[PDB]
Amino acid sequence: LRLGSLEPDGLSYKESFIVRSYEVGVNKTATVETIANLLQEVGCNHAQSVGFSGFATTTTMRLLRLIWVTARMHIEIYKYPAWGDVVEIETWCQEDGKIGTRRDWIIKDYSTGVVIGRATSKWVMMNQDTRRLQRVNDEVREEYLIFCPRTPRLAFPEEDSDSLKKIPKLEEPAQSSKLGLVPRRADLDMNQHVNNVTYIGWVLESIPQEIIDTHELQTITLDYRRECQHDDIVDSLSSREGECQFLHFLKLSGSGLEINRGRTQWRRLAK
Amino acid sequence: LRLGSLEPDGLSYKESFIVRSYEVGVNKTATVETIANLLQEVGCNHAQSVGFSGFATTTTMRLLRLIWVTARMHIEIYKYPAWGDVVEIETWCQEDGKIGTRRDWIIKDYSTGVVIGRATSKWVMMNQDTRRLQRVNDEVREEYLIFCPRTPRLAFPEEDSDSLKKIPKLEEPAQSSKLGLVPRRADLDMNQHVNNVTYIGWVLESIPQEIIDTHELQTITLDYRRECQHDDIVDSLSSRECQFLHFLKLSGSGLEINRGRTQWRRL
Ligand SMILES: Cc1ccsc1C1=NO[C@@]2(CCCN(Cc3c(F)cccc3F)C2=O)C1
Numbered sequence: 269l270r271l272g273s274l275e276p277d278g279l280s281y282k283e284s285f286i287v288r289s290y291e292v293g294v295n296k297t298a299t300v301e302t303i304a305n306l307l308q309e310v311g312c313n314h315a316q317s318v319g320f321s322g323f324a325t326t327t328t329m330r331l332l333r334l335i336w337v338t339a340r341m342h343i344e345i346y347k348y349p350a351w352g353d354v355v356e357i358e359t360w361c362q363e364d365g366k367i368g369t370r371r372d373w374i375i376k377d378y379s380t381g382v383v384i385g386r387a388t389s390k391w392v393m394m395n396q397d398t399r400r401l402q403r404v405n406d407e408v409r410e411e412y413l414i415f416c417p418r419t420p421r422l423a424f425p426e427e428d429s430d431s432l433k434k435i436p437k438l439e440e441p442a443q444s445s446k447l448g449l450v451p452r453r454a455d456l457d458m459n460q461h462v463n464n465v466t467y468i469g470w471v472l473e474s475i476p477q478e479i480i481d482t483h484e485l486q487t488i489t490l491d492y493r494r495e496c497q498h499d500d501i502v503d504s505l506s507s508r509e510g511e512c513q514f515l516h517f518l519k520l521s522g523s524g525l526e527i528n529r530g531r532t533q534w535r536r537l538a539k
Numbered sequence: 540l541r542l543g544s545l546e547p548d549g550l551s552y553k554e555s556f557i558v559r560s561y562e563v564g565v566n567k568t569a570t571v572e573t574i575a576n577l578l579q580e581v582g583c584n585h586a587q588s589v590g591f592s593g594f595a596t597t598t599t600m601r602l603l604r605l606i607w608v609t610a611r612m613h614i615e616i617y618k619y620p621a622w623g624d625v626v627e628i629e630t631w632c633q634e635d636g637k638i639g640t641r642r643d644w645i646i647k648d649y650s651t652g653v654v655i656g657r658a659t660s661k662w663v664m665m666n667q668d669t670r671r672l673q674r675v676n677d678e679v680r681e682e683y684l685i686f687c688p689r690t691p692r693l694a695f696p697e698e699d700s701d702s703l704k705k706i707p708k709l710e711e712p713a714q715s716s717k718l719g720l721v722p723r724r725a726d727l728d729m730n731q732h733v734n735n736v737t738y739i740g741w742v743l744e745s746i747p748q749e750i751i752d753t754h755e756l757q758t759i760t761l762d763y764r765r766e767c768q769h770d771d772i773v774d775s776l777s778s779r780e781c782q783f784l785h786f787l788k789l790s791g792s793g794l795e796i797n798r799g800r801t802q803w804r805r806l
């Protein structure tokens with residue numbers, strides 16, 4: 269009784285959500301964290317519907333002790349849905365160069381069929397024993413390429429997409445910082461790993477209150493380098509680079525080692 | 540396409556939820572926080588369906604500068620639903636003595652119609668300016684009592700309900716504690732207030748890892764005393780009385796935020 273299903277061609281997956289009272293923030297609309305969680309939810313349901321499995325592995329991936337890891341996540345929201353709004357999310361995967369796979373999403377207001385947001389993500393294979401990036405042969409690829417559109421389908425079809433823009437390391441000292449952030453138990457998933465959405469909240473903690481009060485987020489790009497461990501302590505840094513952009517850097521308090529880096533783009537709210 | 544509606548008599552409200560991948564924890568089942576959020580969600584939809592309003596106020600409440608505040612929240616989960624499980628939640632309110640109103644919930648597996656959980660909560664009216672409990676006359680009450688069963692409907696009908704057992708103050712030092720906890724921006728709601736579910740996470744942070752690894756939560760009772768403010772620093776304490784007593788206190792002053800009881804069953 270899910271209202272979540274493969275499309276007729278079996279190469280993309282759609283799921284609808286009614287935005288809940290507790291999912292909205294100050295703007296009376298769905299938080300970035302809610303959106304990120306819905307993108308993940310539809311990914312997982314898609315994975316289950318075509319027979320993968322927490323890590324979206326194939327038979328041969330489990331055989332070679334390989335797992336998918338996020339290199340990049342990019343979310344663009346044109347309009348945050350309010351409480352009671354039904355949103356429909358379509359998601360699909362595609363081959364990305366010689367090391368990567370993409371997952372893309374399109375977010376539509378279910379009522380109007382208008383696109384209100386889009387996301388894309390770059391995934392690489394890692395040997396779970398050695399933590400090394402591992403290229404795989406064509407038959408490993410064929411196991412998931414079956415379930416991808418044959419001709420390029422891009423959520424970001426434009427020429428020089430912000431989705432692909434490199435993120436530099438911001439220069440210390442940062443204009444803005446939230447220091448000594450620690451995972452809570454509620455920030456661990458079903459496999460005892462720190463959830464991506466934890467990193468979106470920590471990025472957003474670095475934004476000055478003045479920006480949060482007068483602007484909402486249009487884009488977030490994260491490049492992941494390391495997993496935060498359950499007893500790690502983290503600093504969220506930001507600097508600027510009716511519009512503003514911020515660079516972001518998450519680093520370990522002790523060692524200064526990069527957890528991830530980010531870019532946010534904001535638009536002034538006039539009402 | 541809500542699947543969320545007043546019952547025929549208009550005196551209770553039912554809503555169904557499909558449990559999502561991100562809503563389950565280590566035990567491969569919906570977290571306490573997910574459950575708490577669904578109970579709140581069905582409360583808010585109920586409030587909107589009979590014309591209240593974020594604060595579930597009536598006309599005369601807004602006039603007397605009164606708001607609802609939770610005195611007690613009690614949740615019993617007999618079975619945590621897995622990812623893909625449809626759960627149905629019925630909720631209703633009832634007059635509770637001379638000062639109090641109750642909201643009750645019953646949680647059913649939609650497929651079997653089996654009760655897998657139940658919750659009850661005690662609410663008082665408070666003057667938002669003075670933070671004092673304020674009794675009101677019968678006509679103020681009648682504004683919300685219209686929308687309640689007149690005769691006893693109890694989620695906890697049993698004689699000496701755990702839901703009504705007093706919570707004593709645990710003795711320092713606590714067996715278990717998480718110190719210097721701070722609300723995140725993401726722990727504030729639409730009105731810049733710390734969400735109840737933040738308190739459930741903080742209660743759970745005080746539970747020894749050994750208990751989390753071998754048991755799941757069957758009951759949680761919280762008595763609320765104060766709101767945590769956005770830049771407050773909080774200590775979450777626990778000791779066994781398996782059952783645990785809980786105490787949330789301000790790091791600075793030592794003042795009680797709330798106190799609690801959890802009951803655990805072996806996995
Ligand atoms: C969104 C999400 C959450 C946990 S893992 C994950 C993933 N999103 O994209 C990934 C990488 C690429 C491999 N797959 C498997 C896959 C196909 F390749 C094609 C069609 C469906 C499908 F599940 C992913 O899902 C991982």
Ligand SMILES: Cc1ccsc1C1=NO[C@@]2(CCCN(Cc3c(F)cccc3F)C2=O)C1
Nearest residue numbers: 582583586594595607632640642662683686
């Ligand atoms: C749902 C909500 C949001 C902010 S406070 C609150 C509450 N949930 O339970 C309470 C207690 C009793 C008063 N009401 C109003 C009410 C009826 F009295 C009867 C039927 C529906 C209804 F919304 C509550 O909802 C407070």
